[PDB]
Design a protein around this ligand. Structure first.
Ligand SMILES: O=C(O)c1cc([N+](=O)[O-])ccc1O
Ligand SMILES: O=C(O)c1cc([N+](=O)[O-])ccc1O
Ligand SMILES: O=C(O)c1cc([N+](=O)[O-])ccc1O
Ligand SMILES: [Mn+2]
Lengths: 425, 212, 212
């Protein structure tokens, strides 16, 4: 169990580390590190852990995109607990193709004004990362007694960037070289707490996902002075035109997909959603002939119990019902999981949460159960894992944390460890 | 597994005689850990043998590499020495449990060591395999002539790519001609290769004409 | 010293249980050879201790490096494994004699091995050292205050550059302050360094004024 009198000491230490918590988040949030260029952020965390004596290791597929793993070692005979957050951020300054103003401020920077900390890089995900870094520092400096190890795992490539078509290799990979790689190469433990922004609501179900490339075919190609008119859209030789029709049929399917595949788990209610994330055909520098083909790119979230092939056939049927010729090809598949045997972590966290936050935990908001978080690799590999942090999700999108809330999370993190890491495996 | 010793000494100053486990040369101590680990390994495969529907798993242990320190600077023995172990798991064994066992062997010898994992992969038994099992069985009985047998344990107790498929919800088995290379067989009979290609083809004609 | 074994097997096929000296894993066999070699070394330094006017030579033996096979491919244990030995010689020991002794240790264990020398240098006692010996002695008693004592064995039983000089007919000795780094001493007293520099200078003033 949690210590009687050893908690107050650790709590007191955490009260004294408040500004150190702040600066760490701000310095960390300030680093340019979108998915694909998290190298610098990893370097910061490595030397931070090193200074605080956690003996970090770089565990990665490339020398400039890696995970950082350190430990706070225990006396012996206890359960291991991982704390996990990711090093990448959502927006790159490069990205004018998905955002109206790719170079805002909230997208890239991080600052402490008012007792708040602003910045998407802080919400997702350096705010929570700082929290358990500080919690670990407190545990260590307060000489807390822990039988089990606390594993400190900062990962790269959590955000759902994936390679496709001519976009291959180092620059476009994410999750394959992130947490699951780290865990597979040593970062194992008995239980795992993923620190991302839920709002002090634990979640231990998460969604899978399948990405589909849908290419619609038409033709024959014609030089613009020869294009046949008028023609019914679905009969157009221009694949762009046909796709425009397929797009609203797929949006209709999507409105219903999420409802049909809603499913309630102990770990949260999963509402699996659909979005069309990209379109193209053909090329902007040769437009004098319309395209014979046109592709669309779909993000389709799965609840833990849905086979991706089932979803693929539904989409193929949508195409068939329109009388269109199309290729529906998957280029990404990941499973979502509900934690098994989570109760010890659930309980350790529950008790801690009530000491610090004051009320029982509530059931998590659906989007935070129905996304991709790094609980999936941990659970896939037999390490029961949940998510818990302060503030609203960046997918919301929230843009700040209250420092008071961050101090609370760091406290909850510590107590959880003091409880859990003294239980026998 | 890294064993620590020391203090380092230039060869003309090495203390002798010293008990192996007390030696300042970690290589010397390591030799003693190697014997303890070899006995533990003999028993591991028996203790964790486990029988499944998909085959009997006999998980083995081998010491695959050793080093300390470097061959081009040998005038002072090493203060450390590392060993690298392949420890196979049945689908139901937590890796941390195995680590504790190895740490316990070390402890029983009074040695200071680091036992650090640098690889973990899970093994699986297929779920919902019957349709593929059945298609294959049928094809197998037509081409080979008699029913299939239960596989030899080493071919159930390794790493093959059935694991990624099963992990990701695709029921998967392994099947081919000849003895395994880990065996090590070094040839195939062309007649057997042809038989397999027939079994593969028939399996496809059955299964791919069933409704999912 | 490279010990041979085999045949290579993928970990799920390794034969157990097997006697250590019969193991297909060369690492396992080597571990047994190491304790035999350590006892041989314990007796070596005593058997080949020898007193010279310039000091008593206590020739020691250490195992300075081990390897087999490679850490990044451990799924098959090695068919071979090497050890690297530092064996000091007194000036009067032929290297081939030592090699046969080691070949014999191996032979007693029934192991197949290659014992291959990759370094040989001769040690020497100075001939005609008296003029330098005396010049230094005079200086030493002046600065340090008593007659010189006989050197500690480790400082006689190493490699220092007196050997090349002696080998080439330049009578040569070694002398300085403090304990040897092989010891390991980690500091000098500034006062003693000054003493030495004085002895060096005085030695020069005597010796360099003799006619050859
Ligand atoms: O954890 C998150 O909230 C999260 C959000 C996004 N996003 O809003 O794009 C991406 C990855 C995430 O982990
Ligand atoms: O399938 C095999 O038999 C096999 C053997 C080895 N090996 O003996 O190292 C490696 C991979 C294999 O699939
Ligand atoms: O002179 C020495 O003490 C000495 C020591 C080592 N060593 O400890 O490896 C090497 C060369 C030396 O001359
Ligand atoms: Mn995130």
């Amino acid at each position: 169990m949690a210590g009687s009198n050893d908690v107050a000491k650790v709590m007191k230490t955490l009260d004294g580390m408040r500004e150190g918590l702040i600066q760490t988040a701000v310095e960390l949030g300030s680093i340019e590190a979108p998915t694909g260029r998290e190298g610098a952020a990893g370097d910061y965390v490595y030397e931070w852990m090193a200074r605080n004596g956690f003996g970090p290791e770089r565990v990665g597929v490339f020398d400039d995109r890696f995970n950082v793993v350190g430990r706070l070692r225990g006396t012996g005979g206890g359960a291991s607990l991982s704390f996990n957050s990711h090093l990448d951020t959502i927006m790159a300054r490069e990205d004018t193709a998905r955002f109206a103003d790719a170079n805002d401020r909230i997208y890239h920077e991080a600052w402490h004004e008012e007792g708040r900390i602003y910045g998407y890089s802080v919400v997702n995900c350096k705010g929570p990362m700082a929290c358990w870094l500080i919690a670990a520092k407190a545990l260590k400096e307060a000489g807390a007694a822990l039988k089990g190890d606390v594993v400190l795992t900062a990962v790269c490539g959590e955000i759902d960037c994936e390679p496709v078509d001519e976009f291959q290799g180092h620059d476009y990979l994410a999750e394959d070289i992130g947490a699951r790689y780290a865990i597979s190469h040593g970062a194992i433990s008995d239980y795992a707490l993923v620190a991302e922004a839920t709002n002090f609501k634990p979640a231990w179900v998460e969604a899978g996902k399948v990405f589909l490339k849908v290419t619609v075919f038409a033709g024959p190609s014609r030089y613009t002075p020869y294009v046949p008119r008028p023609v019914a859209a679905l009969d157009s030789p221009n694949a762009i035109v046909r796709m425009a029709k397929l797009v609203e049929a797929l949006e209709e399917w999507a409105d219903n997909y999420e409802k049909r595949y809603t499913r309630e788990y102990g770990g949260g209610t999963v509402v699996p959603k659909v979005a069309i994330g990209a379109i193209r055909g053909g090329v902007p520098y040769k437009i004098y002939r319309f395209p014979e083909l046109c592709s669309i790119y779909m993000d389709i979230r799965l609840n833990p119990d849905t086979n991706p092939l089932v979803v693929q056939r539904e989409v193929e049927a949508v195409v068939s019902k329109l009388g269109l010729k199309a290729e529906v090809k998957p280029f990404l598949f990941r499973r979502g999981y509900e934690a098994q045997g989570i109760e010890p972590l659930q309980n350790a966290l529950e008790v801690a949460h009530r000491e610090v936050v004051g009320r029982p935990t509530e059931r998590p908001g659906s989007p935070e159960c129905s996304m991709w978080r790094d609980t999936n690799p941990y659970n896939e590999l037999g390490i029961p894992s949940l998510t818990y942090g302060c503030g609203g999700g960046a997918g919301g999108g929230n843009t700040y944390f209250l420092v008071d809330d961050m101090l609370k999370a760091a406290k909850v993190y510590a107590m959880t460890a003091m409880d859990l890491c003294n239980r026998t495996p």
